[PDB]
């Protein structure tokens, strides 16, 4: 990998914004999960606090390679997903705030943040290794949530995922061609996303056959 290319650059340019904007969203979103639930505002600003730490992280990264991210690529392409979480706060619909942010949006990054690790330039390497340690240690205020209120929130985990897993595909997908540039195999990306929303899943109480059924919806 030449990582000073014009080809290298290019392709970071919306990678890096992307990960830019989802750290921003969700800055903004545990901000409003803060305000929404005052009792949990010193747990929910400090996962803010931490979203904005790796912004500024992924902000030096791009710094480091000398690329300017491509914001308004990165703004279109969470638009949809962003407007989800955003409706289902108006309707005070935090199972879906939830499983949006905290499950959904969560493995899907940690899943792109391990594929890039091992093809990132050293910088990036650092800091990316970083950001997952953070995300597995921390707490996870929205699966800790889900999990607690498993049997009254299950089917509107269910009713969440069949609008959002569906969003997440299309998302990796748009962005095919630029991963390649950057030697992140899709699939990987693809594999390391649906174990760890298996595993989280189970976690907050799902079986097998509930988890089979929700990866149907995706489709
Ligand atoms: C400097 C860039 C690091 C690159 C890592 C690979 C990125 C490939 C695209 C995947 C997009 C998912 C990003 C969502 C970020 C927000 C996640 C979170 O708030 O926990």
């Not at 597995?136 to 897993?165: D, P, S």
């Not at 748009?174 to 195999?185: G, I």
Request: charged share 25%; proline share 2%.
């Amino acid at each position: 990998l030449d990582y000073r290319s014009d080809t290298y650059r290019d392709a970071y340019s919306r990678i890096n914004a992307i990960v830019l904007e989802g750290e921003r969203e969700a800055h903004a979103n545990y901000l409003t999960l803060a305000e929404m639930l005052p009792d949990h505002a010193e747990a929910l600003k400090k996962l803010a606090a931490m979203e904005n730490r790796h912004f500024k992280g992924f902000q030096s990264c791009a710094r480091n390679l000398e690329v300017t991210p491509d914001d308004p690529f990165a703004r279109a392409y969470f638009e949809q997903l962003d407007g989800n979480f955003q409706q289902a706060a108006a309707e005070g619909d935090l199972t879906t705030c939830m499983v949006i942010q905290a499950l959904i949006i969560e493995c899907f990054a940690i899943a792109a943040y391990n594929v890039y690790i091992p093809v990132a330039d050293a910088f990036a390497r650092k800091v990316t290794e970083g950001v997952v340690k953070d995300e597995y240690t921390h707490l996870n205020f929205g699966q800790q949530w889900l999990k607690e209120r498993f049997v009254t929130v299950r089917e509107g985990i269910e009713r969440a995922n069949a609008q959002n897993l569906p969003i997440v595909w299309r998302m990796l997908n748009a962005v095919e061609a630029d991963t390649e540039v950057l030697q992140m195999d899709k699939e990987a990306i693809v594999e390391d996303f649906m174990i760890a929303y298996g595993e989280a899943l189970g976690d907050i109480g799902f079986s097998m056959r509930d988890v089979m059924k929700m990866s149907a919806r995706g489709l």
